[PDB]
């Protein structure tokens, strides 16, 4: 009967909670007393990419740590030479409602999508001289919330239908479809090893999906409200999440539970995006309250503030070289900081 | 600089094209076509002559409407309604064949912090079957609180008051309209509300507000 297997579900959940507690012999918040802070961060806008005219929603660095892609409500996906501020390309989007950017690891491809359910992929290096649509990855039922390239041929998508997917860009079919959120998925992050990727949904449950075997290897449920940001720690074993709970938390895939809560009493503002510095010491999260904060992941204190926006700091990325963080905003000016 | 002067030149051409596209996109007026399922959202745009958003657009005497139907795709509304902040008006519509989930939807939209200062046009659609409904059944079944007669005018005014009373802020206006699928009148009222709205926003830009 349904009651019997529901009782078994309750027993299993209790047992795994008990084992998860059994793994909680300590927590980083109490170990970190042995180490000093990085001191105050006071990064300032070394550039401003003032080309956009309506609410940059997402941005993503290229692998060379100098080019960008930025998707905005304007309907333009204009990609930057960060050093000279040049608009090296400006792709006219199919839809202005794009919530997602992806800049391929080779730099050849860019993909973008949003409320249109489609992860459109743009080929930059055409012999014809202009950026053009490589693939319309249609097949999700909800809106898209994040995209990340594993390689130039296969991309992973997170969507509002409570499913992620991994595609074959050469044929446009999902080589794996990932399901098992109860809410809807807001963010996504490939591991550095490209073997496993985490996602977070509005049901406050974040989980790691292995890309080959689509099984969720661990479900994380520490949050009180919707997960809104996802990013892996640079070592590929830990990940951090931001939520409309006005707080972030750090999770570990081998301890399968939460370690830190990134909350201060005065920040009643939701989290729009997260990312890490190259060393993982610094966790950078963009808040609704017109600013980003940068916080020692090992200590959870606000190491500094990168205010300077007229609206929500809607997106955020850090260079692979670790020498710059971009903070897109609904002000449409992409600050570049160092 | 080296020949990268040519890179800066092409950057300038791209930036000028972005500005020329911006000052050609802001001419169009943005409308969000919220509403409950089968309320008549498609009908109004069809008389104007799909798994995700659909953004149908049209012109009406020197004004171009971008008229987004965000309701075709289902997910937590708090995650995609907030995109349409800075839309000029919500074209909220209601069907009376029901239903309180529509009342609840209005109580959400008209109170929403992203639409606090955003006007709303409320089309009470398919009045014809609303008259048939009250003619064949008492309105009390839909509103147990109702004490008025089942005559059309009183019931319609009652439900209209029910909807517009959910407004929590005085600054906005709710241009409720009983369209009854009248051809081209719904478009006219949309235009008139939008003309009021853009006079308001022009006047508010000038520092008169």
């Amino acid at each position, epitope marked *: 009967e349904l009651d019997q297997l529901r009782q078994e579900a309750e027993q299993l959940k209790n047992q795994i909670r008990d084992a998860r507690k059994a793994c909680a012999d300590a927590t980083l918040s109490q170990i970190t007393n042995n180490i000093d802070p990085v001191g105050r961060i006071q990064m300032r806008t070394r550039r401003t990419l003032r080309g956009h005219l309506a609410k940059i929603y997402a941005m993503h660095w290229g692998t060379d740590s100098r080019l960008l892609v930025s998707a905005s409500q304007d309907g333009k996906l204009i990609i930057w030479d960060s050093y000279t501020t040049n608009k090296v390309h400006a792709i006219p989007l199919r839809s202005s409602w794009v919530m997602t950017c992806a800049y391929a690891p080779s730099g050849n491809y860019v993909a973008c999508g949003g409320l249109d359910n489609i992860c459109s992929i743009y080929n930059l290096k055409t*012999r014809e001289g202009n950026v053009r649509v490589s693939r319309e990855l249609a097949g999700h039922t909800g809106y898209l919330s994040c995209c990340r390239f594993l390689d130039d041929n296969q991309i992973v998508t997170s969507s509002g239908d409570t499913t992620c997917a991994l595609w074959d860009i050469e044929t446009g079919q999902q080589t794996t479809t990932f399901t098992g959120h109860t809410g809807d998925v807001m963010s996504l992050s490939l591991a550095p090893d490209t073997r496993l990727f985490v996602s977070g949904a509005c049901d406050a449950s974040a989980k790691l999906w292995d890309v080959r075997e689509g099984m969720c290897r661990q479900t994380f449920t520490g949050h009180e409200s919707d997960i809104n940001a996802i990013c892996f720690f640079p070592n590929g074993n830990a990940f951090a999440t931001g939520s409309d709970d006005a707080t972030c938390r750090l999770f570990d895939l081998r301890a399968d539970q939460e370690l830190m809560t990134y909350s201060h009493d005065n920040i009643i503002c939701g989290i729009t995006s997260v990312s890490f510095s190259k060393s993982g010491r610094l966790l950078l999260a963009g808040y609704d309250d017109f600013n980003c904060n940068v916080w020692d992941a090992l200590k959870a204190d606000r190491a500094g503030v990168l205010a300077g926006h007229d609206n929500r700091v809607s997106c955020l990325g850090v260079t692979d070289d670790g020498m710059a963080v971009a903070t897109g905003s609904w002000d449409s000016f992409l600050k570049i900081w160092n | 600089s080296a*020949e990268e002067r040519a*890179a800066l030149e092409r950057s300038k051409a791209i930036e000028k094209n972005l500005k020329e596209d911006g000052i050609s996109a802001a001419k169009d007026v943005k409308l969000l076509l919220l509403g409950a399922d089968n309320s008549g959202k498609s009908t109004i745009v069809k008389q104007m002559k799909t798994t995700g958003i659909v953004e149908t657009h049209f012109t009406f005497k020197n004004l171009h409407f971008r008229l987004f139907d965000v309701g075709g795709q289902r997910s937590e509304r708090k995650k995609w309604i907030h995109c349409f902040e800075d839309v000029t008006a919500i074209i909220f519509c209601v069907d009376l064949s029901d239903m309180h989930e529509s009342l609840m939807l209005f109580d959400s939209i008209c109170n929403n912090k992203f639409f606090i200062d955003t006007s709303i046009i409320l089309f009470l659609n398919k009045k014809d079957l609303f008259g048939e409904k009250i003619k064949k059944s008492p309105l009390t079944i839909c509103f147990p609180e109702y004490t008025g007669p089942n005559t059309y005018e009183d019931a319609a005014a009652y439900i209209q008051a029910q909807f517009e009373s959910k407004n929590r802020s005085p600054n906005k206006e709710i241009y409720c309209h009983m369209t009854c699928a009248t051809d081209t009148n719904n478009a006219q009222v949309i235009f008139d509300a939008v003309t009021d709205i853009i006079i308001a926003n022009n006047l508010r830009g000038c520092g008169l507000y």
Partner: single-chain antibody
Amino acid sequence: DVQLVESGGGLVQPGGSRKLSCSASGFAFSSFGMHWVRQAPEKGLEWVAYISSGSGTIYYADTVKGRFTISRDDPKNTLFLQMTSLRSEDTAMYYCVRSIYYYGSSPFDFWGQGTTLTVSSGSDIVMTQATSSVPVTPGESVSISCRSSKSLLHSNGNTYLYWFLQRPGQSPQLLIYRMSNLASGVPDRFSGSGSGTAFTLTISRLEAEDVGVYYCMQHLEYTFGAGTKLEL
């Protein structure tokens, strides 16, 4: 299928004028600069003209300034060279070329077919090559060199040199741009390197298809070297 094709050659009386035309297809013309580079019938390449993207900027060769004028009409995907008061030095095969300038782009990535302009009898960056010919054998490795009057390494870190290969009766081709970067189609057999003013290109496992003249070029300031002819 990119096409750079030119027409308007033939005989012209000295002191006259002739308009060479470049009629491109297969790519977004508007995005590109164009140069109407020319080659003497038995000698090296020479720069002539430069029409920028959207016709926003233009330069000419000192040996043709004022005499030769270039014009671009983007809606027809065409570039023009109007030459006036022709001298004997203007006799040459004229190659239309292609370029795009932005981070990581490859200028001169395509070259035209060539038009034979002929007339009867009537503070600069020079490039030089230590060899005019080298005998080579298939499967061996050939190491070309050229040297230019000034260091091409700009402040921004780029060394603005390009390497071209010309086979008999064939349009010239780009191999390497900015001295390290392979063109989108040049086989990985070829590879460039250099520093200061000394500049080289290496081709390992030379096939017969690699025989020809290896003209190098500068691009720091708006010319071609003399080129070495590999012998089969």
